[PDB]
Structure 1
């Protein structure tokens, strides 16, 4: 076993060295009202890592539209990061616009619990989704041998910002839930006056007293989430390999 930050905790406070300079987490993002996704990869100039950075870069504007920043992490130097970014631009034709943390002592890695039994020296493929208050909302741990599904990271952030904004819980497989579709779930009643306004009216669909929902997300919001999943499901038209 190892120790990790937990969902509901403030992301651990730290200044990190990146190829963009020194950044304080989570404050750099909190002070702009931004969410961030921090993700790790084992090493620069590795093929799975390179596919992931290109996947994040292609989705960069999707993240920026949600008000989400990206930051990467490995135990490599900032020099390594800059040369890898130049490799990706020269060979794939894609610019990596977001910072990468350089963690050559493993300090950030040990703090975030990103050293698993697959490697004592390089991080697994961790993801921390952190809201605009600096609180950890979701964590994914993918292994050395498997690339992430980046569209699922976009679905998580979008669904969580809708849940927070509309005061709703999000069903499995939203926005394509097999029971309620794009429906969002009404939380249990907090106070008794905000139990009567709901209980003593309709306006909610219900399977039982503990299971009610409505569809309060904008068509734009629902369609943006559905687009993430359609992109994840689409056979790519042209491969970025075929044009060096």
Structure 2
């Protein structure tokens, strides 16, 4: 039994303490016309969490390019956050450029339903994808033992942004959908007159009045989405621990 915010709702208003200072969410990013990915982890100085922060750091530029910032969250204090970041930079050679929220009393975790049955003291690995209007668009709740696949989070925001501007719905596994590949779906008619006209228009390739699509996405947009997936599928040429 847990209470989580919902897709479609504005991200709960709240002032938080990060290792970059105090900021108000989602105001802080909305004001910059930025989307933001809020993600949490159990505790500082933990292995899986470290691999995740490093993964986010390496992909940071990719997020910035999409006008998407990142912000972390754990039940630890800001001193530990900073110490942990120093450890990471010193031993892994990677600098974490984004802020981490320090939520000592679980206030934030509770408002976001990040505390599950696994642990009553530490948050699981949740992910909130909020858009430039401060509206929650997607929620993922990974557990303590499983690290996230950061490239899917990039594919999600990218797909969301494309769907938003092109006024299209996105098929499964896009841009590599088995049925229409990189095609994007035209929102289904909701009335008999609409369906009738959708077919009469014959302006799109259709499988039925309720299944039409086209290919309005830029070739660069597609290639970029494909880049995320190929990076996820590729075994790294050099492993960081080797230094």
Contact 1:203 1:214 in 2 (8 A): no
How far does residue 195 in structure 1 lie from its aligned partner after superposition?
7.3
How far does residue 23 in structure 1 lie from its aligned partner after superposition?
1.1
Counterpart CA distance in 2 for 1:135 and 1:240 is 36
Unaligned runs of 5+ in 1: none
Contact 1:48 1:146 in 2 (8 A): yes
Contact 2:57 2:97 in 1 (8 A): yes
Contact 1:52 1:148 in 2 (8 A): yes
The root-mean-square deviation of aligned C-alpha atoms, in Å, is 1.6
Contact 1:149 1:232 in 2 (8 A): yes
Counterpart CA distance in 2 for 1:238 and 1:101 is 31
Counterpart CA distance in 2 for 1:190 and 1:98 is 43
Contact 2:189 2:209 in 1 (8 A): no
Counterpart CA distance in 2 for 1:62 and 1:190 is 37
Matched residue SS, 1:175: coil
How far does residue 191 in structure 1 lie from its aligned partner after superposition?
9.2
How far does residue 144 in structure 1 lie from its aligned partner after superposition?
0.2
How far does residue 213 in structure 1 lie from its aligned partner after superposition?
0.3
How far does residue 197 in structure 1 lie from its aligned partner after superposition?
7.8
Q: Structure 1 residues 134 and 190, CA, compared in 2 at 3 Å: closer, same or farther?
A: farther
Matched residue SS, 1:200: helix
**1:105-129 Cα deviation digits (max 9, x unpaired):** 1100000000000100000000000
How far does residue 189 in structure 1 lie from its aligned partner after superposition?
3.8
How far does residue 198 in structure 1 lie from its aligned partner after superposition?
5.0
Matched residue SS, 2:17: strand
Counterpart CA distance in 2 for 1:187 and 1:78 is 46
**1:197-216 Cα deviation digits (max 9, x unpaired):** 85443331100110000010
Contact 1:205 1:212 in 2 (8 A): yes
Range 52-61 or range 191-200, more displaced: 191-200
Q: Structure 1 residues 170 and 209, CA, compared in 2 at 3 Å: closer, same or farther?
A: same
Counterpart CA distance in 2 for 1:133 and 1:72 is 20
Counterpart CA distance in 2 for 1:38 and 1:12 is 12
Q: Structure 1 residues 97 and 193, CA, compared in 2 at 3 Å: closer, same or farther?
A: farther
Number of residue pairs aligned between Structure 1 and Structure 2: 243
Unaligned runs of 5+ in 2: none
Q: Does 1:206 align with 2:226?
A: no
Counterpart CA distance in 1 for 2:174 and 2:236 is 24
Give the TM-score taking structure 1 as reference length: 0.96
Q: Structure 1 residues 27 and 197, CA, compared in 2 at 3 Å: closer, same or farther?
A: farther
| Counterpart for residue 184 of structure 1 | 184
Runs of 4+ with deviation above 6 angstroms:
190-197
How far does residue 62 in structure 1 lie from its aligned partner after superposition?
0.2
